[PDB]
Amino acid sequence: MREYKLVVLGSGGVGKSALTVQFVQGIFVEKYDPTIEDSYRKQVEVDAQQCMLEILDTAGTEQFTAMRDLYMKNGQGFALVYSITAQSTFNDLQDLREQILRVKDTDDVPMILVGNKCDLEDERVVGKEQGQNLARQWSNCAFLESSAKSKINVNEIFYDLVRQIN
Ligand SMILES: Nc1nc2c(ncn2[C@@H]2O[C@H](COP(=O)(O)OP(=O)(O)NP(=O)(O)O)[C@@H](O)[C@H]2O)c(=O)[nH]1
Numbered sequence: 001m002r003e004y005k006l007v008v009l010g011s012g013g014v015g016k017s018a019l020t021v022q023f024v025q026g027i028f029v030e031k032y033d034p035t036i037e038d039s040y041r042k043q044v045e046v047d048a049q050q051c052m053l054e055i056l057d058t059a060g061t062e063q064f065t066a067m068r069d070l071y072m073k074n075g076q077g078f079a080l081v082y083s084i085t086a087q088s089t090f091n092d093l094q095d096l097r098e099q100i101l102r103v104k105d106t107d108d109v110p111m112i113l114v115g116n117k118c119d120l121e122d123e124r125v126v127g128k129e130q131g132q133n134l135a136r137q138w139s140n141c142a143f144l145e146s147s148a149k150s151k152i153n154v155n156e157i158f159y160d161l162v163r164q165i166n
């Protein structure tokens with residue numbers, strides 16, 4: 001079966017681990033905080049094609065490890081995650097995407113922009129239009145708002161990322 005090596009990146013606390021675990025294992029981590037940059041496997045079918053996904057849950061950017069450039073070079077597709085409740089985490093993604101393109105030495109890189117914590121509408125600071133505008137600036141329309149807690153668009157992040165790799 002075709003295998004897809006995916007990498008989840010973003011600033012600290014945005015829900016990288018929560019999204020990965022919700023997708024792969026169907027459970028919400030609550031306050032449990034993985035401290036390993038681990039990989040998580042799940043088989044799916046996207047557009048009538050079977051896919052084995054292996055998803056790497058990276059450390060928050062503030063706390064990035066010596067392995068990060070390896071991940072950026074070798075990953076086949078990237079989910080760049082922010083929280084809709086923290087503008088800093090959103091703006092941080094511009095530099096982060098630039099780093100990936102620098103490492104890859106091309107702009108042709110499968111990527112999805114993910115505004116997580118969409119269940120926290122009362123605490124929103126990043127507008128949905130802001131996310132759409134960033135995706136447009138990147139010339140890549142793949143953009144979702146998600147909630148690892150409520151299971152909104154969680155599977156779709158990974159399906160849509162697969163669609164770009166295909
Ligand atoms: N309300 C809400 N909370 C969330 C969501 N995702 C994660 N969280 C919460 O935000 C906190 C951090 O989540 P976590 O998945 O560990 O984030 P992370 O990006 O992996 N952090 P780190 O960069 O340190 O590894 C946790 O308290 C978690 O329960 C979400 O979609 N909605």
Ligand SMILES: [Mg+2]
Nearest residue numbers: 016017034058
């Ligand atoms: Mg984490």
